[PDB]
Amino acid sequence: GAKNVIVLNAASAAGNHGFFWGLLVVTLAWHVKGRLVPGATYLSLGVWPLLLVRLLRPHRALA
Amino acid sequence: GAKNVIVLNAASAAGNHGFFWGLLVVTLAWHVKGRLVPGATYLSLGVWPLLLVRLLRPHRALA
Amino acid sequence: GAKNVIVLNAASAAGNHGFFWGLLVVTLAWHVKGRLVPGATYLSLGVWPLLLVRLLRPHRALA
Amino acid sequence: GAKNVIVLNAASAAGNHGFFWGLLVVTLAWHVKGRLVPGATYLSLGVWPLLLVRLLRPHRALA
Amino acid sequence: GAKNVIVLNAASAAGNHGFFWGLLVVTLAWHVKGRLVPGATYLSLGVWPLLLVRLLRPHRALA
Amino acid sequence: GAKNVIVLNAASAAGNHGFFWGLLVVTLAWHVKGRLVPGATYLSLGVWPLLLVRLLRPHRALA
């Protein structure tokens, strides 16, 4: 009653692998290249987003 | 040390805690309804898929 | 080796700690707003979905 | 296989750490900016949606 | 708090488990069926992108 | 108790165990092939990304 829980997780890790799966992460990052430039332009965003963050900002482990 | 580490993970959980976040799961589930029926159509792919599955089927865990 | 593992996970948690990351999750939830209403209207999949769920319903950590 | 299962998880964390991969997360968060304003429109969403949320509301960590 | 940190994670897991949520996973998989066939057809990228992937292939865990 | 929290996670892993799920990961990887080449051709920044990563670069798992 121990190595039968975490072990299951281990199986998932094998599935992800680094071959085909590795390619997917790299490819996605490259594609957003063009996406990145339009995204950059945007005014009126000084603290408006931060207020939402304020809820997040205190944080609490023992939530 | 042993602590602080796991504690940090808990903080992430706090971030998740947000009624808005909960709402997102429901919307995705409802939308897929329509997606599901077209998917069922068994066009040209009776056994072709399964060969790929064989690689997946062992589900190694040694990694 | 012992702490040179869980500690590594903790480092990932620090990475999450970013206002930008927090903003993305909240934003995604809001977007599905419009998506949610069409999903509601369908009227179908009465008993057809549940049968599949039956396999899923017992669930088990053994796997 | 004591220190082997947890170790595997650590390896996954290494995979996440990257240059190109990091850029994608930041870009996506700011970009959704535009998506957020349309989302705000509360067209017939006063409280009706919440009833569905009630199912989600108990949560129950017992699972 | 020993049994409070990990416990928080468990709560998240319970939330993931459900009826509507289960449906989402199956539908997404079925839908990509048709998506998969066009993907297969792609000229070039047979033996050239892999070299970049090679850097990823050794992988590590000493992150 | 001790063997209960982690046990819940194991249950999630069982859910993944599904050939259909396996199909989705491979499909996504194949599709991005085409996405990868357009990404390669864009603009010449060179300094725009590194500045962002630089903030990330010191790292502080002591979050």
UniProtKB/Swiss-Prot annotation, chains A, B, C, D, E, F:
Residues 33-36 are cytoplasmic. It is found in: Host endoplasmic reticulum membrane; Host mitochondrion; Host cell membrane. Coiled coil: none annotated. It is a multi-pass membrane protein. The chain crosses the membrane at residues 12-32, 37-57. Residues 1-11, 58-63 are lumenal. Inhibited by the antiviral drug hexamethylene amiloride. Inhibition by amantadine appears to be genotype-dependent. Also inhibited by long-alkyl-chain iminosugar derivatives. It comes from the Viruses. Homohexamer. Homoheptamer. Interacts with protease NS2. Ion channel protein that acts as a viroporin and plays an essential role in the assembly, envelopment and secretion of viral particles. Regulates the host cell secretory pathway, which induces the intracellular retention of viral glycoproteins and favors assembly of viral particles. Creates a pore in acidic organelles and releases Ca(2+) and H(+) in the cytoplasm of infected cells, leading to a productive viral infection. High levels of cytoplasmic Ca(2+) may trigger membrane trafficking and transport of viral ER-associated proteins to viroplasms, sites of viral genome replication. This is Viroporin p7. It comes from Hepatitis C virus genotype 5a (isolate EUH1480) (HCV).
